């Protein structure tokens, strides 16, 4: 007799005993254990005191529970477990970083995860924090399935790496990250205190210096200046439409997009040699591969600047 914990949410457990050699699925339905579909396996010693996840045909209470601990509705939960089954991409180590073999249009996952490996993150939900720790230890499969499900990504479809990063950062406790902005127009003037994902993620320019120095964006009046008066963040990602090949100052890592519609993502890190990543392969840097779309900064991101009034 083998003792196991049954759950849907990872918070509320039920104790059940199983008989050695019983097939899990015949007793419990579709079930996962430590990220692996064990429905067709037999109950061993190995599973003693382990946790088994059920996930189909949930009551309203169970849906609400998994909405708290995963962030999922019933449909996202099914996608999560499907992604765990179908996204078994080979992980390749290169020094302190890992990357994915090219497969099922995953370049946006590859470059998003390569960027994520430079930052530290705390998560509001236990499920996500555990997946993150696994990710930190070189086992990103569970985090990838959470993000893809959470974000409504479709399997085997070229997608957007900023979106993948954004899904992750929205699950993070970023409650101390502040960025104070002044928007200077001739039509009106606005000040904003952005917090959290709004503080660590900026869209419209790749360059951190553009936020400090101030930079123009299209308005309906003569011109809109976007200018940072106070910054205090653990990290900063500046993203833009793929337009430029000129790497800004101080970038730590960056995503690049090459294509005239559907396209391909590559990655660069600004290390002591400088490394260029295309799927699971690494190469000396010889210039941008397409256009920069995401740019990660780490150092000296506590600043105050003069207001422009």
């Amino acid at each position: 007799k083998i003792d196991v914990l049954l759950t849907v949410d990872g918070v509320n457990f039920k104790s059940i005993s199983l008989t050695v050699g019983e097939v899990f699925g015949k007793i419990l339905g579709n079930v996962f254990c430590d990220g692996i579909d064990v429905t067709k396996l037999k109950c061993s010693d190995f599973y003693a005191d382990k946790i088994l996840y059920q996930y189909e045909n949930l009551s309203l209470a169970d849906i609400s529970a998994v909405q708290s601990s995963f962030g999922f509705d019933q449909q996202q939960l099914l996608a999560y477990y499907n992604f765990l089954t179908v996204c078994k991409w080979s992980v390749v180590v290169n020094g302190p970083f890992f990357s994915f073999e090219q497969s099922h249009n995953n370049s946006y996952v590859n470059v998003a995860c390569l960027m994520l490996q430079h930052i530290n993150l705390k998560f509001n939900k236990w499920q996500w924090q555990e997946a993150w720790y696994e990710f930190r230890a070189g086992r990103p499969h569970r985090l990838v399935a959470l993000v893809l499900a959470k974000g409504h990504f479709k399997f085997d479809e070229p997608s957007d790496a900023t979106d993948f990063i954004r899904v992750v950062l929205k699950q993070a406790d970023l409650s101390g990250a502040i960025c104070e902005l002044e928007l200077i127009c001739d039509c009106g003037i606005k000040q904003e205190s952005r917090v959290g994902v709004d503080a660590v993620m900026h869209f419209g320019t790749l360059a951190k210096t553009d936020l400090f120095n101030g930079y123009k964006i299209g308005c309906n009046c003569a011109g809109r200046i976007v200018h940072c008066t106070k910054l205090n963040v653990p990290f900063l990602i500046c993203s833009n439409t793929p337009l430029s090949k000129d790497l800004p100052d101080d970038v730590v890592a960056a995503n690049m997009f090459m294509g005239v519609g559907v396209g391909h993502y590559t990655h660069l890190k600004c290390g002591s040699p400088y490394q260029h990543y295309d799927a699971c392969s690494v190469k000396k840097y010889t210039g941008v591969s397409g256009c920069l779309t995401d740019c990660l900064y780490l150092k000296n991101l506590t600043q105050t600047f003069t207001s422009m009034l």
Partner: protein
């Protein structure tokens, strides 16, 4: 007032400026819906940004303090495989 109509502007990567009729109580979802009517772009491909800040589907223009005659920026999600 929350239900009173106003104009906002959406700038595209093509140089074009959309004019939208919105109410401050409209969600970002609603605004994206209106952009599909006018421009044929599916809401889930749209990324709406105000001054560097990406706008969440479930929140309202009032939530973001987007007021009459404001300018938004529209870009599409990228497709890298």
């Amino acid at each position: 007032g929350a239900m009173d109509p106003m104009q906002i502007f959406v700038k595209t990567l093509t140089g074009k400026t959309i004019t939208l009729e919105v109410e401050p109580s409209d969600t970002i979802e609603n605004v994206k819906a209106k952009i599909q009517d006018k421009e044929g772009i599916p809401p889930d491909q749209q990324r709406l940004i105000f001054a560097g800040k990406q706008l969440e589907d479930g929140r309202t223009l009032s939530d973001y303090n987007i007021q009459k005659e404001s300018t938004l920026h529209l870009v599409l999600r990228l497709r890298g495989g």
